[PDB]
């Protein structure tokens, strides 16, 4: 009755099925969400980018925040592809921050472990921070990407 699995699920659910990165708010404003991309599609898709997430106050945005006038509909965006890494793309009207350091808007940046993005800068009382959790499993699969498969 899902009783046993429930035990394993809470203690540590099976993550990495197709999980790219996870967004967690540290300032306590937006609920945690899970970003993901299909591995088969990533390997099969030999293009520039595979799947990109858009975050902001927009209901369309892959990430819906609470309601910060300082933040834009789509404050920031995350792209997944290249080869076996992740990139962060800022897209806010006010700007996107990384550990206190403001990055170039609509610019691609190299992913960081447990990285954190700050937004709504201008007023110490109007800034919101977000933490990114990268799936170790995803990194492992990406490393092997296409299995040799011994015929």
């Amino acid at each position: 009755a899902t009783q046993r699995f429930l035990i394993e699920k809470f203690s540590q659910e099976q993550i990495g099925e197709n999980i790219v990165c996870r967004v967690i708010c540290t300032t306590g404003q937006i609920p945690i969400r899970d970003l993901s991309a299909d591995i088969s599609q990533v390997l099969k898709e030999k293009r520039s980018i595979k799947k990109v997430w858009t975050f902001g106050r927009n209901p369309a945005c892959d990430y819906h925040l609470g309601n910060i006038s300082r933040l834009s509909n789509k404050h920031f965006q995350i792209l997944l592809g290249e080869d076996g890494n992740l990139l962060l793309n800022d897209i806010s009207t006010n700007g996107t921050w990384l550990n206190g350091q403001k990055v170039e808007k609509n610019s691609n940046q190299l992913l960081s472990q447990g990285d954190e993005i700050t937004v709504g800068v201008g007023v110490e009382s109007d800034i919101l921070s977000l933490v990114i959790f990268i799936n170790d499993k995803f990194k492992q699969c990406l490393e092997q990407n296409k299995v040799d498969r011994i015929r």
Partner: peptide, 13 residues
Amino acid sequence: SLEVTEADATFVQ
């Protein structure tokens, strides 16, 4: 009315 995102005007400091 509109809904322009409140953005500062400090020549992007």
